[PDB]
Amino acid sequence: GSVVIVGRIILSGSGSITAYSQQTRGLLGCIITSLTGRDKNQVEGEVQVVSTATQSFLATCVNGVCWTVYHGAGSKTLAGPKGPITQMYTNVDQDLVGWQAPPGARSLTPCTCGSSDLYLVTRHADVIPVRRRGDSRGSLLSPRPVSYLKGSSGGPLLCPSGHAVGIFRAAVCTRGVAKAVDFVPVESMETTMRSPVFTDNSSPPAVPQSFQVAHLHAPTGSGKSTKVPAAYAAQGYKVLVLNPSVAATLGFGAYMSKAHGIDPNIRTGVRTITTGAPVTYSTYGKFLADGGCSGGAYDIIICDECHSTDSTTILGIGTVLDQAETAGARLVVLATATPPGSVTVPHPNIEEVALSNTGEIPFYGKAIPIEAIRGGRHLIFCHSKKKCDELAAKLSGLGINAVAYYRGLDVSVIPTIGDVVVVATDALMTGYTGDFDSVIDCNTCVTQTVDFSLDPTFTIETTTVPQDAVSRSQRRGRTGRGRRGIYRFVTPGERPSGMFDSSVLCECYDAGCAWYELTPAETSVRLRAYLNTPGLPVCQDHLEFWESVFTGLTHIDAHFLSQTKQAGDNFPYLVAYQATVCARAQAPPPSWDQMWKCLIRLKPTLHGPTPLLYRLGAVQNEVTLTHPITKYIMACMSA
Amino acid sequence: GSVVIVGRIILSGSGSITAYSQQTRGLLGCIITSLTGRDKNQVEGEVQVVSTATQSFLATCVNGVCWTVYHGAGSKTLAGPKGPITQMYTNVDQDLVGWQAPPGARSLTPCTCGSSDLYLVTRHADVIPVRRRGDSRGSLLSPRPVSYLKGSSGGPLLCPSGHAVGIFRAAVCTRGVAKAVDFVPVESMETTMRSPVFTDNSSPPAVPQSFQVAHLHAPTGSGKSTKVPAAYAAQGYKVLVLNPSVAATLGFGAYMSKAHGIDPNIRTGVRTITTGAPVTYSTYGKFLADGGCSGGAYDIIICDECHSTDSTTILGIGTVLDQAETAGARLVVLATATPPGSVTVPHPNIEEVALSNTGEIPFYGKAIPIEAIRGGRHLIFCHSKKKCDELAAKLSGLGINAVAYYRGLDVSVIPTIGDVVVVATDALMTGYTGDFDSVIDCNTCVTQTVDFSLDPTFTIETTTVPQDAVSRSQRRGRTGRGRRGIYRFVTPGERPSGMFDSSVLCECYDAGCAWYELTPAETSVRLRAYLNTPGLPVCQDHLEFWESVFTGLTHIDAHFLSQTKQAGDNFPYLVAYQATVCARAQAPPPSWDQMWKCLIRLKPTLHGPTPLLYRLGAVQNEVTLTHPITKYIMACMSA
Numbered sequence A, B: 001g002s003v004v005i006v007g008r009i010i011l012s013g014s015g016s017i018t019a020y021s022q023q024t025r026g027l028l029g030c031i032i033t034s035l036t037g038r039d040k041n042q043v044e045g046e047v048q049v050v051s052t053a054t055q056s057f058l059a060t061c062v063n064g065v066c067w068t069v070y071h072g073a074g075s076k077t078l079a080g081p082k083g084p085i086t087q088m089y090t091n092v093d094q095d096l097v098g099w100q101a102p103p104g105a106r107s108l109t110p111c112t113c114g115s116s117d118l119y120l121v122t123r124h125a126d127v128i129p130v131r132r133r134g135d136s137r138g139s140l141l142s143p144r145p146v147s148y149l150k151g152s153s154g155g156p157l158l159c160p161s162g163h164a165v166g167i168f169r170a171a172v173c174t175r176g177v178a179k180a181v182d183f184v185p186v187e188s189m190e191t192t193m194r195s196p197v198f199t200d201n202s203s204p205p206a207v208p209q210s211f212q213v214a215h216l217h218a219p220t221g222s223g224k225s226t227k228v229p230a231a232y233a234a235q236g237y238k239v240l241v242l243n244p245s246v247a248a249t250l251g252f253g254a255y256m257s258k259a260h261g262i263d264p265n266i267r268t269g270v271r272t273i274t275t276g277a278p279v280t281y282s283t284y285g286k287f288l289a290d291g292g293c294s295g296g297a298y299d300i301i302i303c304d305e306c307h308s309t310d311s312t313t314i315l316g317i318g319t320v321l322d323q324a325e326t327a328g329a330r331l332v333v334l335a336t337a338t339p340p341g342s343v344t345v346p347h348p349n350i351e352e353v354a355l356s357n358t359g360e361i362p363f364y365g366k367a368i369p370i371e372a373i374r375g376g377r378h379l380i381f382c383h384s385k386k387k388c389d390e391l392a393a394k395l396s397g398l399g400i401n402a403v404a405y406y407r408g409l410d411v412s413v414i415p416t417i418g419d420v421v422v423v424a425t426d427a428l429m430t431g432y433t434g435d436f437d438s439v440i441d442c443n444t445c446v447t448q449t450v451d452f453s454l455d456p457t458f459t460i461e462t463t464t465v466p467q468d469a470v471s472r473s474q475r476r477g478r479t480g481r482g483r484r485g486i487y488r489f490v491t492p493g494e495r496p497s498g499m500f501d502s503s504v505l506c507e508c509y510d511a512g513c514a515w516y517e518l519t520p521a522e523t524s525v526r527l528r529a530y531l532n533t534p535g536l537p538v539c540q541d542h543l544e545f546w547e548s549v550f551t552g553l554t555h556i557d558a559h560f561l562s563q564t565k566q567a568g569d570n571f572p573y574l575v576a577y578q579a580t581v582c583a584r585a586q587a588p589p590p591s592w593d594q595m596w597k598c599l600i601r602l603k604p605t606l607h608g609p610t611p612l613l614y615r616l617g618a619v620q621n622e623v624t625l626t627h628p629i630t631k632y633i634m635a636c637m638s639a
């Protein structure tokens, strides 16, 4: 689907800065236009009201380029007269994207006066005075609730003369009140428009003399983890190769022994081998467990699957970026098949067939014909363990050799040879390396989001979301490996890649405390190195907030920490910490869900309201907001 | 737009109760079908997945009728083979709506076994066990979060034999956790299947021997406030006529004097006239101020505009319904042009013209041609005081004679003779009597909603919503009275009439305390009489909750109460009480917005966090959730 112009904000060309909205399309015209990518409507004005099916925001024409926010548009095309217009610019680090404006259309020009008295144009066509405080910051003269500014991103920041100062990107807000605005400066778009549109990162970089951070954007079939380290090693270099998966790590070592005749050093929690070879294959977790970089150990560190937004990868890459120069490394290679802002393109070996309602197996509102899976090795992706169980049971009833695989299950469940239908969650890609005849994708995943809810503090909620380009690629990538494959899907609608939630940062401080004997200040240092490095997945800088939160979570119960860590669920430090305050109060947990099992044995001795620190799921008990830790966490929000 | 079948939930006919979902339409087909009302698709199954543009829910086929919830479907038609199917049944009191099922619809049959082990079918095709506890209630064996059950209303409650027990209507929940389900019993559906096709009450009821509550559903201008009381008075009865508007109340005294030859008693806060006549015209407010019903004063009480969901009307009607029998009244007449579940029908002397983008005056994304309003008397409805000011200023710049009118302005602003463009909010409806050449409607209104947000307690937020059938009728009704009128609109979309928010109940307890020297217990009594009376607008029974809240708001500062009451804003009791808590704890208000003007004489003394009781707007200051009143309000939320 394309981004559709559904209206426009008309700015006054004389006197005071005033604006008015003019709708040009309704929901029907907007949906039709999104599907076709053809918009024959005359585009007028500098500020556009744009829409996707799920979202609405603004776009501004400055110097012939129609600009918007990456968070709203993603890598989507813009519906135009001749059909879909492809993005000319996509800068995930600045959250800015730009399409070539349909010829004739009016543009704003950059401001020359250097004024600090600014005017933000909203989707409501209101002109809000802003005082410039920095390069990308300006303070609202009168604070507005956050909800007032929703849908105004991509809107312009004007000077008194009506020229462009920047594009509205984010709201600087405390407890749901916006007091300042964050914007992309116009001079940044002027730099972008002056520079090369295409960049090359398909071939590995040559080893420089000074320390350097390089990007490697090559397909899974380029051997970023095999051919590339082998090649560097043949050149006589010390190489460390990091990956999120144990299975991937071991398998690449097993490949290098059989194929390239080198027996590498292997470092995983399960298996460690030390041969003294010039190549080491390690997981990010083992690398973090080991204490990260040790002096003069490696020349080149390859961070494979650097698009991965799991807390271990973020913390691992962050560690590499903070320590590598110091430990005498000359090159850091951020390698990935799917960099941020990626658009899934067809694969020559993979036939893609949309799932219809013609079939004997119900699957996500659609159907799977029994012929597509009867005989052969097939992988079906489900968003949850529940769905896996149901689907594998339905298939076993139909005489199909079906197996469910998810977190907490052994990889032996998957037969390595016979006819099989593997029904799995994303847990498969880090647990098993095998490939299949066909892949059936539900096109949905499960994500954790942080909500600064103030009931009393924050909430970490698990949500079902449409898959992004990375998810679609990793999943589809299970088939068509050096042979022909089939990929069947429920929907083609993908979400923008390269962005992650603040709850992922919270997981990094959690892991740092629970597993890596890292103080919140050490973790911040490591994540800062990741944040300040361009070309990696992006996130809101909540580093100081999370650091402050964890800094106060002192004197956790060691026994609860041990249990939560072993159970393997999300948040072992926060769960153990909430249990610690409960146990010490002889108070029951927020609920009796599996999350709070470490308290089951104490159940007959637990009474009263819960000293609630934060919300990690449903709270079925009465709560008390009087605990000093709750007051501490509340004080962290109001900074 | 029509309600569209977008999918189906397929139930097992053998063994254990299992279900699966099957989508039949995408967003495009759904939107097209909604517009046309034509659905040629085959209707397989008993449970349907239905959708409007804004909402999705379920519908179940029972005894040839396809049933759903009023809150979901309103009075909307269902898209069918021959075009839009009009509702056969609309019972707002039960929240049940029914259309005649198309061919192919296999209907479930009512349960005969009388089992208490029930099974709720969700939109996620999950079969949830429920234990029947009453006629319309059942408890969930394992509590589920509220968000899990959203979109499942109109879904069936099945017995172990797969028969229909009732349809899922509402969730019984505490702090966002659903612990029980409220359902329409299947027997109450056959009671609806009995209800008349016309239900005639277009004519006033004859006075009965015993006390009775009658409904009068007649058009505006049909003399429900004039001919009907005069007719009863001629028979020798004492008549009280109640209205929400002072302007209407005064107006009726002039018409009745000149036309029906009766100089009536007039009772308003502004003006009271006592002639000793057998007819009295009073506002609901004055009636409440007077102490309500006094013994043997009236024989007939007419509650005009009984569709009005303002706190005064609800409290006024409630007072009448609780006191009338006792005070010796023989008849209570609930009169309205727009009863709950009303659908706006064409008016014979009103030409309706959709606004386009062809015009010189911007108006809500559309445009007003200057010729439509230059000369003549016109009324333009805006959703806010802000929009009125802007529009009246834009028109005055174009040499038009424009005037803005809203709450807190004197009605003298409107010229009674002369070319004029009145730019007004719904405040006009109660302030001004008159008729216009044309009406231009923005089709949106402002409503207050209560959010049980737990940050720490509840929130009363102002929101913009699409207008309902009552709003559209009252607004359009300002033209076409005794002369050809024109009605111009932004959108045809109208939401369901006859339902109101729990914050309206909160306003009743507020008014009871602030103005009517009514204890929370007295208010509850009066509102219960309104709730338990069928045929009136419906609401969630939160009387005990609000009563308990206000009961704890003890020893308010009389001076703050006086100040808030005099300013004329929304919750004078809640504002004054929060100020009282601030002044006493010597802390600043939640913000320095006009809402907290009363605490200005204390601005230098008050410092620290705010002892926050509830949220009435934006909170810019630090908060403390330790105040005993906050803990009291929090304890009230638990049931």
Ligand SMILES: C=C[C@@H]1C[C@@]12NC(=O)[C@@H]1C[C@@H](OC(=O)N3Cc4cccc(F)c4C3)CN1C(=O)[C@@H](NC(=O)[C@@H]1CCCN(C)C1=O)CCCCCCCNc1ccc(F)cc1S(=O)(=O)NC2=O
Binding pocket: A055, A056, A057, A058, A071, A072, A073, A092, A093, A094, A095, A146, A147, A149, A150, A151, A152, A153, A168, A169, A170, A171, A172, A173, A182, A499, A538, A539, A540, A541, A542
């Ligand atoms: C309140 C109105 C704001 C203008 C607004 N923008 C946002 O929400 C953005 C989105 C999200 O930000 C991002 O994704 N990024 C990516 C990114 C990359 C580089 C630099 C950046 F600043 C950002 C910000 C959080 N936002 C923010 O502004 C957030 N604040 C911050 O990021 C701040 C800014 C200062 C630095 N730090 C640390 C922050 O936390 C406040 C979040 C308000 C909740 C609403 C989120 C829904 N937004 C949304 C989501 C999807 C869409 F397709 C369109 C929209 S929108 O509706 O079109 N967005 C907006 O209108």
Ligand SMILES: C=C[C@@H]1C[C@@]12NC(=O)[C@@H]1C[C@@H](OC(=O)N3Cc4cccc(F)c4C3)CN1C(=O)[C@@H](NC(=O)[C@@H]1CCCN(C)C1=O)CCCCCCCNc1ccc(F)cc1S(=O)(=O)NC2=O
Binding pocket: B055, B056, B057, B071, B072, B073, B092, B093, B094, B095, B146, B147, B149, B150, B151, B152, B153, B168, B169, B170, B171, B172, B173, B182, B499, B538, B539, B540, B541, B542
């Ligand atoms: C969450 C699952 C629940 C089944 C569900 N139902 C509701 O939300 C209903 C809506 C609203 O209720 C009503 O409007 N009515 C109208 C009405 C008239 C007469 C008798 C009645 F019982 C009702 C109930 C509050 N609801 C409720 O259930 C609420 N609870 C109560 O009313 C309870 C029940 C017991 C008595 N008291 C006092 C209550 O407060 C819980 C509030 C949940 C937040 C709102 C969710 C969105 N609702 C919504 C709005 C518009 C739509 F078109 C469709 C939906 S939906 O998504 O289709 N709704 C549902 O699926």
Ligand SMILES: [Zn+2]
Binding pocket: A111, A112, A113, A114, A115, A159, A160, A161, A162, A163
């Ligand atoms: Zn300038």
Ligand SMILES: [Zn+2]
Binding pocket: B110, B111, B112, B113, B114, B115, B159, B160, B161, B162, B163
């Ligand atoms: Zn039965």
